[PDB]
Every structure is written in C-alpha cells, then in structure tokens.
C-alpha cells in the first residue's frame, strides 16, 4: 500500500483508464472494458516511467494479459 508517488498498477490503472469509472466495480473473469494497444500504450506510458516494464509493447504485453485478470481486454 503506497499512496506518495508512482502512477498506480496495470490492472488498477487499467480498470480506472480501460476500466472506465466502473461499470464492474467486483469482476472476476468477465469483460466490461475493451480497448486497442492505443489505450493499453498510453496507459503503459503513464505507468512507464515506474513499472518494470521492458518497452512499450513490453509494458502493453504485461499490462493487457494483466487486464484480462480484470475486466477490459486488449487488442493489438
């Protein structure tokens, strides 16, 4: 629990930007979301400079399997 610095994770970060304000709100293995790599890019590059992400479609590859254990799919 960390609330000083560094933008938030894939999933939550993805449930707030592709997960919109919260049209699940208790997921589990359901979609509610679906966005291309345009939104899972700029969504890695917020969290970019502070994920351990390995590029752009490094961080996207990581941050869409990581939406799907959500609600928002992801396509490339």
């Known amino acids: 629990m960390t609330f000083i610095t ?13 997960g919109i304000e919260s049209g699940s709100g208790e997921p589990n293995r359901n ?15 917020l969290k970019m400079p502070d994920l351990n992400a390995a590029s752009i479609e490094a961080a996207m590859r990581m941050i869409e399997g990581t939406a799907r254990s ?6 490339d």
């Open 31 to 45: 979609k509610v979301a679906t966005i291309k790599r345009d939104k899972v890019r700029e969504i890695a590059e």
């Open 6 to 18: 560094k933008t938030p994770p894939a999933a939550v970060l993805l449930k707030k930007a592709a």
């Open 70 to 75: 959500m609600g928002i799919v992801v396509e």
